Structures are given as structure tokens and as C-alpha cells.
Design an enzyme around this catalytic site. Structure first.
Site, PDB file in Angstrom:
ATOM      1  N   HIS A 270       7.421   7.625  11.931  1.00 38.17           N
ATOM      2  CA  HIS A 270       7.293   9.006  11.487  1.00 38.17           C
ATOM      3  C   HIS A 270       8.450   9.430  10.590  1.00 38.17           C
ATOM      4  O   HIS A 270       9.432   8.704  10.455  1.00 38.17           O
ATOM      5  CB  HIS A 270       7.234   9.903  12.718  1.00 38.17           C
TER       6      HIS A 270
ATOM      7  N   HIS B  55      13.577  10.363   6.009  1.00 37.11           N
ATOM      8  CA  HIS B  55      13.616   8.952   6.371  1.00 37.11           C
ATOM      9  C   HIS B  55      12.627   8.514   7.447  1.00 37.11           C
ATOM     10  O   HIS B  55      12.094   9.327   8.195  1.00 37.11           O
ATOM     11  CB  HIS B  55      15.026   8.573   6.834  1.00 37.11           C
TER      12      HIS B  55
END
Lengths: 168, 168
Positions: free
Chosen positions: B34, B115
Site C-alpha cells: 500500500h 512510498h
């Protein structure tokens, strides 16, 4: 890819199921405790929007489901799957069979056993032992679930949520 | 109750991340690849309606985000966390920024850096070996993500999806 339609219960019930899943359910790290509403299926990517599309209508014409959990049971000797049995209702039955209409078209609608799996892929001995200690373990939980989730499978076998659908 | 708000990228990217998380990320079995949520927070599960409202609206004035993953990098020496870097954009920034307003207001940041984690909680030595492998390992992936999810933490630390929001 592979799609799945399930209900995710209250975390109190998820934690309960996980206190056993952590040791007897290979799916432990694959997907959270859940109650399958339709057998998973294969669906073409560009034929997904209409999918979500149909699920919304099925959802809109439904209401939050009451889930009365009453005991631990198994599918043996058909399958060494151990689970928290949910009392079946006409509501559960109707949603399940609706999930086999339209673009999720057919091949089915039936002997539907709503359940929350706590153990699977157990050898017969493995299974006896678990069902054993799990038999003398009472359970009386009831709740209402107001939504269902559409998921897809990853290469590692785990499941990721694509969309949530509110009921009624 | 712990909540997180995140983005789940295509299956193709999750699998890529998972080929590394399986080895280096303790979250591997807790949640699929995720791109963070806004920091996770402690809300009173009962005032979750506000939350869901505020989110539906934030999602209303947003648009599908473009994620162009450029490489593997690290947050050392602050944290031995190795990740796949997404090119920062005004969009991601603006949305990240809107996740700290209203009922979700509190003291924000320290550099929001888009990220997808593949490794964390690593010793200095193992981290040195992995970065030496990945830092120059090529990666070029681009996709458009049109939704974010709100999830809550179970007793065992894993995260379950509560609701999904469509952008636009």
C-alpha cells in the site's frame, strides 16, 4: 483475475476467529476472517466496471444482515474445514442467490452454508484434535453487518479489497 | 480503535512489492502492499460516521492519482525502511494535506514522502545488504489509482478494510 465477495464481521468476531486461525488456517495471512457470500470467480478486467455496477444494485435492494453465531462445526468428512457456524436466514439466502444473476450469471444458487472459517487443510487427526478442544468451547455472538466487499487475489494468494458496498 | 487511510495499487505492483515483502517486511502478513494512508490515528469507533463523511467529501474534490514508481530507496538512518519510490506530485500532496483537516486535524507530518514499503524493522546489517541489492535495481511502473481505503487494526495487528472511496 480472481474475484471474491465476502462480509467482514465486527473485529470482536474477527479477533475471536483469529485466536484460532493463527494456528489452524493457512489463509490467516491471506485474508481477514470473513463470511463468503459467493464462490470466487474469474472476471475480465475491462468487464469489471459493470460488475461493480451490478453489485451496487444487488446491494441497494438489500438490507444489513443479522449474523447469529452459535457454535463451531465442520464440513467433514466432505472437507476438514472447521468454522464458526452462522444461523442461516432467508436474507442471507436471497443475497447469495442474487450474486448468481446478471453478469455474475448463474451456474448455481445453492445449499448455502454461511460460515466463518477458523481452520482448514487439516489432516484427519489434526482435525479431530481441534474439533475436540473446539467442541467444548461455547459461542454466542450476534451482530448486524451493513456492507460487503469485492476482492481480487494476488499472486501470493492473498486478497485485496477493490470496493466496498453499503446495504440499503 | 486504530484507523489508517491508504491506496492499494494494481495487482501488478502489489505482487512486485510482495516478492520482497515476503522476505523483509513484517507487515507482509498484516496488510497488502500500500501507499500510505496519512498517518494512522486513534479515533473513537463511535464517531466514525463523521470520519466517513469527511472522507467521502475529500474524495469528492479529488481525482484519480497517477503513481510513477522510479526506484528503491531508504529512510536510513532515521528508520531502516526500504521502499519503492513514487514520484511526489501536487495531487498526492494536496490530498495528503486534506487528510489533516476537519475532524482529522491534529499535528501532521514530517515530510510526506509517497512510498510503498518492501522492507522494514531491519537490522543495520541486513538493511545494508538489501539496499545494496535494490538501490540500483531498476524499476519503472506507472498507473492511475482511482480510490483510497479506510481500515482499522485487529488485535493481531493486521488491518481490515472498513470502506472504499472513489475519487471524483
Amino acid at each position: 483475475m480472481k474475484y471474491g465477495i465476502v462480509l467482514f464481521p465486527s473485529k470482536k468476531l474477527q479477533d475471536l476467529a483469529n485466536s484460532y486461525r493463527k494456528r489452524y488456517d493457512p489463509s490467516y495471512s491471506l485474508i481477514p476472517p470473513h463470511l463468503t457470500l459467493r464462490a470466487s470467480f474469474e472476471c475480465a478486467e475491462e468487464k469489471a466496471d459493470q460488475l461493480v455496477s451490478h453489485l451496487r444494485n444487488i446491494a441497494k435492494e438489500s438490507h444489513p444482515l443479522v449474523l447469529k453465531m452459535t457454535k463451531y462445526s465442520s464440513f467433514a468428512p466432505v472437507n476438514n474445514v472447521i468454522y464458526i457456524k452462522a444461523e442461516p436466514t432467508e436474507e442471507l439466502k436471497t443475497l447469495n442467490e442474487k450474486l448468481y444473476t446478471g453478469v455474475l450469471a448463474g451456474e448455481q444458487e445453492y445449499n448455502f452454508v454461511p460460515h466463518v472459517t477458523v481452520g482448514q487443510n487439516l489432516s484427519d487427526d489434526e482435525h479431530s484434535d481441534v474439533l475436540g478442544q473446539l467442541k467444548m468451547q461455547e459461542v454466542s455472538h450476534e451482530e448486524i453487518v451493513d456492507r460487503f466487499h469485492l476482492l481480487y487475489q494476488l499472486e501470493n494468494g492473498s486478497w485485496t479489497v477493490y470496493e466496498t458496498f453499503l446495504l440499503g
